Amino acid sequence: QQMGRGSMCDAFVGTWKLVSSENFDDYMKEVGVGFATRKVAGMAKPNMIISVNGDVITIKSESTFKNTEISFILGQEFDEVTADDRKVKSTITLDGGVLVHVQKWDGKSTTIKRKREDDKLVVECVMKGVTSTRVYERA
Numbered sequence: 638q639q640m641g642r643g644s645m646c647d648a649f650v651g652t653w654k655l656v657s658s659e660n661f662d663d664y665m666k667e668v669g670v671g672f673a674t675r676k677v678a679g680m681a682k683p684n685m686i687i688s689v690n691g692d693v694i695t696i697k698s699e700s701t702f703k704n705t706e707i708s709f710i711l712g713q714e715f716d717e718v719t720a721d722d723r724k725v726k727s728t729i730t731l732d733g734g735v736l737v738h739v740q741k742w743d744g745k746s747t748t749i750k751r752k753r754e755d756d757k758l759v760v761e762c763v764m765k766g767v768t769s770t771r772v773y774e775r776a
């Protein structure tokens with residue numbers, strides 16, 4: 638085994654904490670999340686842990702609502718059970734410097750984008766015409 642080199646994806650790696658959220662309840666409504674789940678999920682201030690090991694990216698969300706973990710290879714679709722218990726087919730790619738996560742279920746689709754902006758990790762969640770912006774800071 639030799640030490641691998643880095644990647645552009647290293648800008649995402651680390652431990653992040655949610656510091657702001659806008660329009661998340663409206664995004665969740667558009668997604669189809671029920672009232673009680675929306676209320677509890679909207680209160681959560683997760684930590685998000687992003688790591689890379691070879692071609693495998695792991696995104697771990699630790700919260701008081703749910704914990705989730707996904708591991709994947711860019712461009713390669715996988716099964717995901719979301720925090721609100723949708724069973725989706727997901728593909729994550731890069732669009733420039735943006736991690737683009739598309740989730741498909743029940744004939745619906747939503748896109749989550751993660752991008753570095755200054756010292757922040759900005760998350761855009763889009764369902765149809767509804768966008769929510771969530772901002773993480775280094776933990």
Ligand SMILES: CC(C)Cc1ccc([C@H](C)C(=O)O)cc1
Pocket residue numbers: 655665668670678683685698719720721749760762771
């Ligand atoms: C709560 C439900 C809609 C699933 C869910 C949970 C977290 C997030 C964003 C990506 C984040 O990690 O802050 C989007 C969607």
